[PDB]
């Protein structure tokens, strides 16, 4: 509740064994307003033969990022620090570890 002052292209989604697409999360009451989130194309991964292999899975890698939300609502130069969860990319996971 402490308010202070503060001074104000990649194509792996298409070349990965666990590809994904970008979703455009937009919130005008948020900085940054536009965040690109990842959603995997397939359940499995692409094997050497180029098919969807279901011995492995495509899962999103999710991180927590700091964002600024306008507090009070619809009020510039005034923000509340927030912590949201976004999907940055998809990776391929196997059930066997060696």
């Amino acid at each position: 509740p402490r308010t202070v002052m503060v001074n104000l292209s990649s194509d792996y989604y298409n070349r990965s064994t666990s590809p994904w697409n970008l979703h455009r999360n937009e919130d005008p009451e948020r900085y940054p307003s536009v965040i690109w989130e990842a959603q995997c194309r397939h359940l499995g991964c692409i094997n050497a033969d180029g098919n969807v292999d279901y011995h492995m899975n495509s899962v999103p890698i999710q991180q927590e990022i700091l964002v600024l939300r306008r507090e009070p609502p619809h009020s510039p130069n005034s923000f509340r620090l927030e912590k949201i969860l976004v999907s940055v990319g998809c990776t391929c996971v196997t059930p066997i570890v060696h």
Partner: single-chain antibody
Amino acid sequence: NFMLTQPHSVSESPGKTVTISCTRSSGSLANYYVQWYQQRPGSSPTIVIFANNQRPSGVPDRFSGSIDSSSNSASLTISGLKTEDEADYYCQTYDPYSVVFGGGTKLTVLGEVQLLESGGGLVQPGGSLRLSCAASGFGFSSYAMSWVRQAPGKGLEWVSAISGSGGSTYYADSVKGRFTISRDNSKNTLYLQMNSLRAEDTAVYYCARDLIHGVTRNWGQGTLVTVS
């Protein structure tokens, strides 16, 4: 989807070697992993073989799994039988949409991850009920979960599944449209909403942790649900 056909029962003497088959009805068996589980009388199902032939820590090397692509079937071979091995043995594999368990083979010998279920009980035909699964001991958000039921007098039956993030949901045909699976990664709890229950839904519902979609690795205690 597909069916998994096992022999109904097998009976051998201690010390011999036994083989249990598991034939897939549709789809190439070599395209999806096969898992083997052991269920003792009144006990929770435990894993014996996963990923076709991978044996976990704690299972003696006399257990082993193998796959035959020409017959489209999988086999669990138990060499050197003993009284402890006397239990039910289920095979399990998957397709991109569902998870299927076999009918189960009853083997008779001739004479840390933690999952807690809750919410089961008695309910009227048509009522609603929700189960919870308290997960602990692992990164809950990084694992797909699933519900597996066992009706009294029947074998293991897959109910539903959910991805780690919660974006993908799967249901069995007998359950889809009436049940709703969801999860809360912040509280490490997995839920199963049940609506419009029928007398067939009387079963023990187990919580299941899956390394990948359709490869179950850990089981819960199970909660009893009776509808009458």
